[PDB]
Design a protein around this ligand. Structure first.
Ligand code: HEM
Length: 116
């Protein structure tokens, strides 16, 4: 599914091909951008504080957990997505992998079934 890797400051390091299809950005456009560009406010401005919180305290909240959130595409449309975060280390620095699954079709079917 969509895979994204960031360093300890939330900057995107690797951006899969599927992530390019899901979010709109090419990998070259994405690499070097903060991860907060893939999500709407209030989370967007808050995100770096979430990572900071985790880094200074070492007490996890969603690391190793899989949850549903709203992502935000290049065109600005929002969508529900299942997010799973992995923490890794390399060259002495922490990295984080996010595996995303688009749930837009699940939300649509569900709404349609409720609508009818
Ligand atoms: C694009 C949709 C995303 C949203 C809405 C989002 C939102 C959030 C929120 C709300 C928190 C704090 C959760 C809590 O304190 O309970 C958080 C933490 C964090 N997010 Fe994201 N995130 C997004 C994607 C990502 C991705 C793609 C990555 C990794 C590649 C990532 C990495 C992190 C990290 C490292 C933390 C700290 C975890 C912790 O506090 O245990 N986020 N995110």
């Amino acid at each position: 599914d969509a895979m994204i890797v960031i360093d300890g400051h939330g900057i995107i390091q690797l951006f899969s091909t599927a992530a390019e299809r899901l979010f709109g950005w090419s990998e070259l456009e994405a690499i070097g951008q903060n991860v907060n560009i893939l999500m709407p406010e209030p989370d967007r401005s808050r995100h770096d504080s979430y990572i900071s919180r985790y880094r200074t305290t070492s007490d996890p909240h969603i690391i190793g957990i899989g949850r549903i959130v709203t992502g935000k595409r290049r065109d600005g449309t929002t969508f529900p997505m299942h997010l799973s975060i992995g923490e890794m280390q390399s060259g002495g620095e922490p990295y984080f992998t996010g595996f995303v699954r688009d749930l837009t079709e699940h939300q649509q079917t569900q709404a349609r079934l409720q609508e009818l």
